[PDB]
Design a binder for this molecule. Structure first.
Ligand code: FES
Ligand code: FES
Ligand code: FES
Ligand SMILES: [Cl-]
Ligand SMILES: [Cl-]
Ligand SMILES: [Cl-]
Ligand code: NI
Ligand code: NI
Ligand code: NI
Ligand code: NI
Ligand code: NI
Ligand code: NI
Lengths: 402, 402, 402
């Protein structure tokens, strides 16, 4: 199926959803890994997860597995989780703390910067300098760790310069992960995004979220117009109080920040609309700060509120499988059972994620039929989906080309 | 493996079973879907399952999923279970009742004839007339629903004209499904058929069925001879009493009807040989009416008795997986616990199906070996298998050709 | 991936581990089956498992399944487990006893030499002489059964002549299987071997085994040197007492025998180092006889002790899956609960196998990464791994070539 990616891209019907092969074909999926996930910057973890020198996590991206580890100098570095002897995984656990990286097979021992310090009985010609752990590009942006698997990484600095002032409001280096949830959705990674970038399905599918989150297309979507005055008043209210808020969509479509108002009265994504956490994460001047929306394709969407923040990570597994990992961030000194209640903090987005998963899964299932033919996106209700698809096709064409 | 279907077909050894690739190869399986299951008429359901206007079922055939739904005008129609917006499955459940077909993703709402009645905020250029549900051919034959996935369906009327008078004896529009059983057999769909079209394995494998069902090859098989006089006397007894019974095999081999006698004394497929249901389904003049045998390749075999009927449906899943769905039909006013007992009604064919599944599964497992070489079919004991294989190869060659 | 096996082999970096494709690629795995497992001699079972005329086992090798059966004349024969009618498996069970081989589908009945004795109603032209069970080459070597799936088997006699005198010490025709364990390791079959042919990982991974088994590289490995004097003294002690012991590695690298000393004091692979069984299997002159090490690629490694013996069998399942079957052999008259205790006899190698499985599985997982690059084998600690890889590449090149 599809001949080649060039022909598939050239056949796309403007304003419509993607040809079936984009969502089902095994070769297109490998192209998506090679041209997108193995070339672009990827959101990995909040930095607060690496709490001490020697702290690490491991992270699977396609066929890669990456160790992300905080050094004795407190700098976070990334490496391929693959011993230079016979290839074994070095860190078997998803998280831990170790003063060295020690391969469990034959004990080759690496410094937390990747250098091989000891390898037993390798004989007179062995060169430890040629057998250090292979490196992965790693950046820290206002308390969030990004990685890149390519030999040569694209620019990070345009993104960082735009996003840093919005993100600094939330003091994320002093957060902790109050809760993590990882779900596997039986849909193509692109269907997860298309679903995330519209609220056309909200009225019919999200009771708990719709108590606080407007299904206004100017909030979620990408509109060409002058800013609606309710949005602008919120931007000005927040900026007068020292919280960067104005809408910014990058020129190439990869990322967007905007601090959008919630529904009348609402402070946070909770059943009652009130803040979940009594000790707030960051410097929000008032409880009804709305939500700082941030996306950065292909891996992350996020909501940063007055009291807590929620960071999301998308990792493709197969043409019809995608992991979504959600983390709720609260102030590091906020105590469960005193300053917040775990169920109250998490229930809205746990329910919302499952609802999104359901619609994505039945969308994929219908797309599997040879009868599927892509229809048109709603110009007003799915402007964000059109924008995502344009980012994807344009990026695929550029990264594939010369 | 096999180069192409033309070469595989051209290499078939007359009178022998099929080359391994026919039963194992992934490309041959896709050819079977494309040339047979996606082109021919397929038995779906008894009409009695759609009990009211708005009633529907869904049905998977290969990668297709079909909604079969009874309209407000009582006409049963079929559609692809795929929304014209972004492709979602519309009906998630295997069965239900709805006055409209409403997509659960963004609520596009279709009439029970497939027309798009409402789609929210699709903008000034949207044409609802171009976004109706895609249709599937659908026919009702004496209370049985058949479908066809091809753009242009083959003739149905020769089949219907032959079969209708035999089928009308059983008054199937006034039946109900007393019981349904669906099993996945770990064999190629062709092995399920080859097994169904012989009773060479009966003596060794079916104790409960052999109490009532003769393993005479003139009953199950396809013999060139003049009709054995015990069979002819039954045909005449039944026809004198107004029940069409005489043997008919279609010219192209696709279908066969004949009302065959059961063993001495037996009325029905029960452990004691007596009718299972006190209130009979249809107009049988006497209890020992034998069984109306009907096959129609590639999807259905059936047994219609004096008291009840059993209809079977074969749907391929993978090269080594096949679903067999069995439904026991009784008169709609027959009450479980009064007019019949569920265990008594169903036990013989539940056991027989499991026995068939076992032999099919160990046949497939042996065929998987590179040592497998097709042997000869018994000319007398497997005349029906030879006939099935000839239908399959001839149909594959015709549908593939110009 | 890899273009073809010739190019992959030609690109191997001397002294290093194999390119990723050798351990992951589906086509290379099929080449390994076709060129190695379907051409060479394979260890199947100890003969003592077939205790009586009519006794059989079945054995899966890739897509083949083999019946190994003891005849009424006490000769063990092998056949393809595939009926000559429609291909069914004949023997569904892993083991049993039958005076004839009777197909369960339609009862074709074969003699224990494979000849078709009866097939019902096959008509006047049927030739039973042309429908006997297809044969598999089968040899018995001092109580151990080997098979070969090729039309023409390679020489067995050089192997047999070398190994017989070492093996006869252990009187294996008078053993019984005290215990069997089969585990599926989530690694390529070559990783199982590479792991087996070194003790570089021993210090870090095998507490129970290291109580008795030296991690000396001259014991496990393949060294060019003059024999270390502790090894030679053991060879001479054992040979003076009539037990063949001296090191022999075949010219082509396929097999090796040597009776190696265990650690100070140790008699057997037990937690306390003492013999597990009071009634010894074979003629060992003293309890501290060391272990007769035997490998024969691609299927078997073994340890034969004074008191009991352990025989191991490697069967590939998929590119990343390998079955390891371990059998503990004791004297046929040794009684569990009197002459030995099952836990004491088996615990060391059950634990050791699981430990090996763990390291093999995490080695495979790391190798799956596109970042994997083969490193160098330890010249002194992994001489046996270098030797195995050389046997594999040389055999693959010879069997593939003209
Ligand atoms: S594979 Fe890591 S030390 Fe050997
Ligand atoms: S996919 Fe059906 S309404 Fe959107
Ligand atoms: S398949 Fe063995 S007797 Fe028919
Ligand atoms: Cl969102
Ligand atoms: Cl039948
Ligand atoms: Cl060993
Ligand atoms: Ni949603
Ligand atoms: Ni259109
Ligand atoms: Ni049967
Ligand atoms: Ni023949
Ligand atoms: Ni080991
Ligand atoms: Ni090197």
């Amino acid at each position: 199926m599809h001949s080649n990616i060039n022909t598939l891209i050239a056949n796309h019907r403007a304003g419509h959803a993607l040809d079936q092969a984009f969502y089902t074909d095994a070769e297109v999926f490998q192209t998506d890994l090679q041209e997108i996930f193995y070339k672009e910057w990827l959101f990995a973890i909040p930095a607060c997860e690496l709490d001490k020198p020697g702290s690490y996590v491991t992270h699977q991206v396609g066929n890669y597995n990456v160790i992300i580890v905080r050094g004795a100098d407190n700098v976070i570095r990334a490496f391929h989780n693959a011993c230079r002897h016979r290839g074994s995984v070095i860190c078997k656990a998803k998280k831990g703390n170790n003063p060295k990286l020690v391969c469990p097979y034959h004990q080759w021992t690496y410094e937390l910067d990747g250098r091989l310090l000891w390898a037993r009985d390798m004989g007179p010609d062995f060169e430890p300098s040629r057998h250090g752990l292979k490196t992965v590009h790693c950046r820290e942006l206002a308390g969030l760790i990004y990685i890149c698997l390519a030999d040569e990484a694209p620019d990070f600095e345009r993104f960082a310069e735009v996003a840093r002032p919005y993100l600094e409001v939330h003091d994320l280096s002093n957060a902790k992960v109050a809760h993590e949830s990882s779900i596997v959705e039986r849909g193509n990674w692109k269907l997860v995004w298309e679903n995330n970038r519209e609220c056309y399905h909200c009225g019919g599918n999200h009771p708990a979220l719709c108590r606080t989150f407007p299904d206004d297309p100017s909030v979620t979507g990408i509109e060409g117009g002058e800013t609606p005055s309710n949005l602008q008043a919120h931007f000005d209210r927040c900026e007068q109080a020292g919280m960067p808020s104005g809408f910014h969509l990058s020129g190439d479509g990869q990322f967007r920040v905007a601090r959008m108002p919630l529904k009348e009265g609402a402070e946070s994504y909770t059943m009652d609309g009130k803040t979940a956490v009594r000790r707030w994460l960051g410097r929000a001047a008032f409880a009804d700060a709305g939500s700082l929306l941030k996306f950065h394709y292909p891996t992350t969407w996020n909501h940063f509120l007055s009291d807590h923040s929620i960071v999301f990570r998308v990792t493709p597994i197969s043409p019809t499988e995608t992991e979504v990992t959600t983390k709720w961030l609260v102030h590091k000194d906020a105590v469960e059972g005193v300053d917040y209640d775990l169920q109250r903090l998490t229930e809205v987005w746990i329910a919302t994620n499952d609802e999104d998963r359901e619609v994505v899964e039945f969308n994929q299932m219908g797309i599997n039929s040879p009868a599927y033919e892509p229809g048109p996106y709603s110009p007003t209700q799915e402007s964000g989906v059109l924008q995502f698809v344009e980012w994807y096709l344009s990026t695929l064409k550029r990264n594939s080309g010369p």
